[PDB]
Amino acid sequence: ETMIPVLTSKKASELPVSEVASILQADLQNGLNKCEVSHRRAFHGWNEFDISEDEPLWKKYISQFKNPLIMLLLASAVISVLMHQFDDAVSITVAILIVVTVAFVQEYRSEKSLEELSKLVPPECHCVREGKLEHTLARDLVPGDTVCLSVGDRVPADLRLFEAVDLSIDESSLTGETTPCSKVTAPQPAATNGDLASRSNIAFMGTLVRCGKAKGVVIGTGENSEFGEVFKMMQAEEAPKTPLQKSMDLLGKQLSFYSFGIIGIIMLVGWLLGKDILEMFTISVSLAVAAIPEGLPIVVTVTLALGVMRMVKKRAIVKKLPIVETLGCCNVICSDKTGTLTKNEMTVTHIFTSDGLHAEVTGVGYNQFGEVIVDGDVVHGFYNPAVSRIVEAGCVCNDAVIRNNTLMGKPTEGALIALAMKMGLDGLQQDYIRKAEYPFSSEQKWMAVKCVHRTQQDRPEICFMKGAYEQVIKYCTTYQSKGQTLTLTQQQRDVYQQEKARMGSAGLRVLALASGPELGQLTFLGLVGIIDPPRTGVKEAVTTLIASGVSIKMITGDSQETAVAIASRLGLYSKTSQSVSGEEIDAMDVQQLSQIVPKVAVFYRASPRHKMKIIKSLQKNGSVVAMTGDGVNDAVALKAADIGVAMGQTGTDVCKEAADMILVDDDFQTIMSAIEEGKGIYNNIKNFVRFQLSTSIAALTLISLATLMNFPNPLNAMQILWINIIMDGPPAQSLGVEPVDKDVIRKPPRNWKDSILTKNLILKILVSSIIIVCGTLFVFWRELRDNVITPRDTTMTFTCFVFFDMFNALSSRSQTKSVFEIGLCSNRMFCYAVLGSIMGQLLVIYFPPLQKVFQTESLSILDLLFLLGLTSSVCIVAEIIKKVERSREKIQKHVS
Ligand SMILES: [Ca+2]
C-alpha cells in the first residue's frame, strides 16, 4: 500500500518541503499516529546502527587453547600418554578441562559486563505525534516523524527542515569545520553538491545545535544515511585505557617475569640433583600458570563496572571509564548556587513585624513542611495579629499560585504563598474579591490591589501594599503598635532602615508589606526575609567533605552579602577566607591569582569566562576540580577542565554528550557517594592484589623449600592447579567484589603519584606468607615421622594449604577494619563461593573418581578438626595486628 521509500539527503534537499512531505506521507503539524509509527517500525526497524555479529561460545572455547602454557601442559600430557602412564595423563587432562571451563566462565562474565556497560546514556530527542509534543528516545524515531530542535539539543537523525529561526548547528564532528553554518528552509540547487559544504537545508545526524529553534521531518534513520556510514565506521573502536589499568598491567608483567625467572631457577636447581624430569617440568609449568596474573585486569574491569552500576543505582550516571579513578583524588571539589547547593526555589526565612518581634520560618520549598516560630512559640493561623496581617496582605495581594508543589510566576511571590500556606492560610486569597489591580513594573518596583471581603462586601475597601522598602514607606503614614495605630515618625523609619540593612547584610531579599484603605494613607505591616535556602543534606555533606580535607569552592552570580551568608550558614567560610569579585577576575587573570585561590571560597557576579579563568588557575598549581554547570556557555568549562559533574534534569544535551558524568537529581549529595564507591573499588583492588601476592609467595616459597634439599614435595600438578583456581577463580572474584565500607569518606584524598603496593600491605603479605609456609612445613614434618606415607602427606598438606588460603581470603577482606566489624556474613556471594569451594574440596577428597584423579586418600574427623584448628593461626594474628594498629591510631588521634 504505497510503501514509504527512504529519501537520501541530496534528494530530500533538492525537492521542496511539500514534495518531501507528500513522498514520506508525513503530517507537518499533527505528526504521525501510533499505529503508523508501529508499522514503520515493523518495516524499517530500530533507529540504531547495525550491530556486528559476535563469535559464538565455541569460538572463545577454542581461542583459550592459546597462551601456550596450556600447550606445554598438553605436550606433557601426550608425552605421558606415550610413556604408558594413563592415570596421570587423564588426571592432567581433566584438570586442563576444568581450568579452561573456569576461564571460559570468567571471560564470559567479563565480556558480558563490558558489553552491558554501554546502555547507561541513551540518545534523547523530542518528537511531535497526534498533535502533541512527546518526549521519546531517538531509537523510536521512524521516517516521516516531526522532531523539534532546540538550543543545545543533539540531532537524533537526518531531517528535512521546513521551519527554522536563526539555526546554528555544529558539524565539526561530521565535517571538521569549526565554524557553525546557518541553516535555511528553502530548497538548494542540485548542482551545488559535493560534500556538504553548502547543505543548509538538510539536518544531519550526530551534529550539535548551538543556537536557534527549528522543526524538521526525518528522512532516514539507522543505516540509511549519507554520513551514517561515516559515524558507524567511527564507532566500534577500542576505548582508551585508564592509567590504573596500565599500572595494573605493568605490575602483572613484572610479577610474571619474576615468577618465570624463579620457576626457571628452581627447575634448574632441581634438575641439578637426582629427580624426575617430567614430573618436575610439569609441576614447574603448573606453578608458572598459577603465579601469573590472568584475573587481575579482569577483576579490575568487573569491579569498575560494578562501582559504575552502583553509582547508576544512585542519582548519578558515569560515562567514561578513566574518570572514576579520579573521583577519589578530587580535592578542589567545586559547586555553584541555584541548583547545586541550593534548590532553585525561594523560601521566606525571617519575618520582622511593625512591633519589632522577630519570626523564624522553618522548612524549604513550596510545601507544607515547615513552621513559623515567634519567641520560641509556633504561630498558626491568626494567633499572632502582627504576622497574620502581613501574611494576609501578602497572600491576598498576589498573582502567583502553587499547584502540586509547582510554581509559575514570580519566585519571590511564590515563596510568599508558601509562607502563608505553611500555617494554613492558602484559602485566604479566595476570601477576597479584587476590584482594581496595579501590575508590577521595574520603574515603580511595587504593586498593589484593591479588594473587599467576599462575604463582607459592606466593609470598606482594603488596599494591600508591597514592594521595595523605599517605595512602600512613601505611601505609609501610620503603623500598628500592639493593636494600636500610631503615626510613623522618623525614628521608627530609621529603625526600619537599619533592620532592612541588617537583613540585606545577611543575604535576605528585602520585601516590604503594608495595608490600608487607600493609597497614601496605608498602614505599614512589616518586612519579610527571602533567601534561597540550602538543600536538606548540603550542610552535612559540606561539613563531611571539609573535615576530611576536600576543599569546597563556591561560585555564584549574586551579591557579596548573599554569597557570604550562604557560605557562613553552610561551613564554606572560615576565619581566614577572602572573596574575589568578577571584575577583579577579569582585570587580572592567571599569574597572581593562584597565590590567593587556595584561600578563597566565594565567587560572586561571575561568568563562564571567569569559570575558565578559575579552572586554569586551579589546574596551574595542580589539583582535581569538580566544576559544574548546565547550558551552552558551560560547555568548554566542562571540556577543558577536570571531571565535569553536570545535571541531567535542567541541563542540556551538550553537557550530557560532550562532557563527563551527569547527575539526574541535581543535588550535591551524589558526589560523596561516587567518591566512596571509587575508594571502595580501590580498596577491593588492593585486597585482591594483597591476597594474590600472599598466596603466590607462600606457594613459591613452599615449593622452593621442598626442592632445595631434595625434599619430597607435597603438591603435584593437579593440586597446584586447584590452588591456582582457588586463588584466581570464584574466590578471587568474591574478594574483588565487596560492598564499600562507611569509613573511607574520612580518609584524606588519594594523590595521583601513589602506588598500590604500600609498605603496610607488603609487610602483611610477607607475614601471612611466612605464617602459612611455617604451618604447612610443620604439618608436613609432623606427618612424616615414619618416613613412608605417599598419599596422606600430600592430601593433608593440600587441604591445609586450601584452608590457609580460605582463611587468608577471610582475613584480607579489609585492611583497617577487622572481619568482626563488617560481620561474618556480609557478602552473600562471597559466602556462596566459600561454601562451593568447601564442597569441591570435600568432593575431591572423598569421591573415588576424584581420589584417583587427584591421588587423594580419605582423611578422618580428628585430622580435619586438627587442620581447622591449626589453619586459624593466621587469621587471628592478622586480626590482632589490625586491632593493635587501629587502637594505636585512635590513641594517637585522641592525645593529639
Ligand atoms: Ca594464576
Residue numbers in the entry: 15 to 910
Give sentences from the paper:
Here, we determined six cryo-electron microscopy (cryo-EM) structures of human SPCA1 (hSPCA1) in a series of intermediate states, revealing a near-complete conformational cycle. The overall structure of hSPCA1 is typical of a P-type ATPase, with ten transmembrane (TM) helices (TM1–TM10) and three conserved cytosolic domains: the actuator (A), phosphorylation (P), and nucleotide-binding (N) domains.
We found that the TMDs were nearly identical in all three structures. In hSPCA1, the N domain interacted with the P domain through several residues, including Gly518, Ser519, Ala520, Gly521, Ile545, Glu575, Thr576, Ala579, and Ile580, with a distance between the 480KGA motif and the 350DKT motif at ~25.0 Å. Meanwhile, the A domain interacted with the P domain through multiple residues, including Val165, Gly166, Asp167, Arg168, and Leu222 in the A domain, and Val646, Asp667, Val668, and Glu671 in the P domain, with a distance of 33.2 Å from the 350DKT motif to the 189TGE motif. No significant conformational changes were observed in the TMD and the A and P domains during the transition of CaE1 → CaE1-ATP, with the root mean square deviation (RMSD) being 0.83 Å. MD simulations of the CaE1 state showed a solvent-accessible cavity facing the cytosol formed by TM1, TM2, and TM4. During the Ca2+ transport cycle, hSPCA1 starts with a loosely arranged headpiece of cytosolic domains, with the N domain ready to bind ATP. Ca2+ from the cytosol can then enter the binding site through the cytosol-facing cavity.
